[PDB]
Design brief:
Chain B: This is Transcription initiation factor IIF subunit beta. Chain B: Belongs to the TFIIF beta subunit family. Chain B: TFIIF is composed of three different subunits: TFG1/RAP74, TFG2/RAP30 and TAF14. This is part of a larger assembly, with chains A (231 residues), B (37 residues), C (180 residues) and D (45 residues). With 231 residues, chain A is mainly alpha-helical. In chain A, 55% of the residues lie in helices and 5% in strands. In chain A, strands 1-2-3 form a three-stranded antiparallel β-sheet, with no helix packed on it. Chain B is rod-shaped, with a radius of gyration of 27 Å. Chain C is an alpha+beta fold and 180 residues long. Chain C has four helices and ten strands; from the N terminus they run βαββββαβαββββα. Chain C is elongated, with a radius of gyration of 20 Å. Chain D has one domain: RNA polymerase ii, chain L (Rubrerythrin, domain 2), CATH 2.20.28. The chains are: A mainly alpha (231), B mainly alpha (37), C alpha+beta (180), D little secondary structure (45). Chains in contact: A-B, A-C, A-D. Chains A and B meet through helix 4 and helix 6 of A and helix 1 of B. The complex binds zinc ion (2 copies). One zinc ion binds next to loops of chain D.
């Protein structure tokens, strides 16, 4: 009920307040008549969830920003009707993957699936409903460097792979059959361009892509070798 | 003594975090009614 | 345009009105399957129209596999006659189509990521989980599966016009997001 | 856009906003601010 205080110059009165504030003198003054306006300026469910979530993101070594985006997300979902279940494992993984997305970081469905057993398809449905709720409350490329890390590849290899991913997506032809296959194949091409051996089975194991898949991607990718060359 | 792993360090970290690799080992994986009666 | 969706599957329900002895039904039908341990219904089939029926003890029946509404009612009446012929006091009632599936080809590739970004509140696209974009239309309330190839799947319809309505409504959008 | 410099290779970048922060041609995330072009005056006193 009212209670809002406004500062106005009784001698000026011309405008609303147009003033400056002097922190050192700790006083506030009308900039016009130079009058001092003021003086002596002074200088249960949830907690359990965020606990286990905390543990999960921690083991995942995700930076606190991601952790906190997921926390925020989860609070919004919380107890709502439409969720109607999922036992608290699905929600924690969903909210996590969200906070990853929203944080511009990328994590594969498989990776989170390695931290938690969500049964997969059930996970997709929960993730979609949560996504819908966020809209109501109103991009593979990042994966490419992360994979190099796993292989410990030189920088030039990584950037080559980035050019390769953009070029491959534009040329279409299979649309990608999920991004993961394209990211790994793009690498496999780029590395085979260079002399550095990973061979094949080692990358298929290490990065968990079916060897047949990498070779299959390789043939079509090989066909378009013409236009993928950065220099 | 203690042995220092000399690798590119990327491979070791990939195995550390979420690796997209799971399982591969198992530990704590955890007469009718008339005549009948 | 010029493209009109093709109907691919029609699912219907029918009330027979009397209780059934499933072992008897399965035993007497010419084309029946019944394993109580797997599913609680006799899976009966007829050759014309080629369909499959799920027959329950309550006398309720689900008929699926038909490509037209005509074929659905026809095959349903036929299944009901079989039950009668086996000896139960069945009646063909409450025939109602519950789901209609349709599909077509727009003949050009589509940019799913652009579409998902633009029509975000109706779209769901996770290419690593499933390659098609799931579009949930408001009016009519139809679900469309959109693929990079330009092939389209429409489902959730109770009437044929809804399949036709949804495609007409989606076509301009698919055009806006074409690749060539 | 505004001109920056890499940490190590000292290459001129001039990356724009929403490019995050990284060098192109190497991974160093340390970017120098590429000294002002306009003239600065001193008194030798
Ligand atoms: Zn004043
Ligand atoms: Zn540099």
């Amino acid at each position: 009920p009212n209670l809002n205080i406004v500062l106005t110059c009784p001698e000026c009165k011309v405008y609303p307040p147009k003033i400056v504030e002097r922190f050192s003198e700790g006083d506030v003054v009308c900039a016009l008549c130079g009058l001092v306006l003021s003086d002596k300026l002074v200088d249960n469910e949830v907690q359990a969830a965020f606990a286990k979530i905390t543990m999960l993101c921690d083991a995942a070594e995700l930076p606190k920003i991601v952790k906190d985006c997921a926390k925020e997300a989860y609070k919004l979902c919380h107890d709502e009707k439409t969720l109607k279940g999922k036992s608290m494992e699905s929600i924690m993984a969903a909210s996590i993957l969200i906070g990853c997305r929203r944080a511009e970081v990328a994590r594969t469905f498989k990776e989170i699936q390695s931290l938690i057993h969500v049964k997969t398809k059930e996970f997709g449905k929960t993730l979609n409903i949560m996504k819908n709720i966020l809209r109501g409350k109103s991009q593979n490329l990042t994966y490419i460097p992360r994979f190099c890390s796993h292989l410990g590849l030189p920088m030039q290899v990584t950037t080559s792979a980035e050019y390769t991913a953009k070029k491959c997506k534009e040329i279409k032809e299979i649309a990608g059959k999920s991004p993961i296959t394209i990211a790994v194949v793009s690498i496999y091409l780029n590395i085979l361009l260079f002399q550095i051996p990973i061979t094949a089975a080692k990358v298929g194991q290490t990065l968990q892509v079916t060897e047949g898949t990498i070779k299959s991607g390789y043939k079509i990718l090989y066909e378009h070798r013409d236009k993928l060359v950065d220099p | 003594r203690i042995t220092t792993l000399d690798e590119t360090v990327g491979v070791t970290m990939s195995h550390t975090g979420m690796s997209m690799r799971s399982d591969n080992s198992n530990f704590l994986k955890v007469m009718p009614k008339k005549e009948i009666l | 345009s010029g493209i009109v969706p093709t109907l691919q599957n029609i699912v219907a329900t029918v009330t027979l009105g009397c209780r059934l002895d499933l072992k008897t039904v399965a035993l007497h039908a010419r084309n029946a399957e019944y394993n109580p341990k797997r599913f609680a219904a006799v899976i009966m089939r007829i050759r014309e129209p080629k369909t499959t029926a799920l027959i329950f003890a309550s006398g309720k029946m689900v008929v699926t596999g038909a490509k037209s509404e005509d074929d659905s009612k026809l095959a349903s009446r036929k299944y009901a006659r079989i039950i009668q012929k086996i000896g139960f006091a069945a009646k063909f009632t409450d025939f109602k189509i519950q789901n209609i599936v349709g599909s077509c080809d727009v003949k050009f590739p589509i940019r799913l990521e652009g579409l998902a970004f633009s029509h975000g509140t109706f779209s769901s696209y996770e290419p690593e989980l499933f390659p098609g974009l799931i579009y949930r239309m408001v009016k009519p309330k139809i679900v469309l599966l959109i693929f990079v190839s330009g092939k389209i799947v429409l489902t959730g319809a109770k009437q044929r016009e809804e399949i036709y309505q949804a495609f007409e409504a989606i076509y301009p959008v698919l055009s806006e997001f074409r690749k060539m | 856009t505004l001109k920056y410099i890499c940490a190590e290779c000292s290459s001129k970048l001039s990356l724009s906003r929403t490019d995050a922060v990284r060098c192109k041609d190497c991974g160093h995330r340390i970017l120098l601010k590429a000294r002002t072009k306009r003239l600065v005056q001193f008194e030798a006193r």
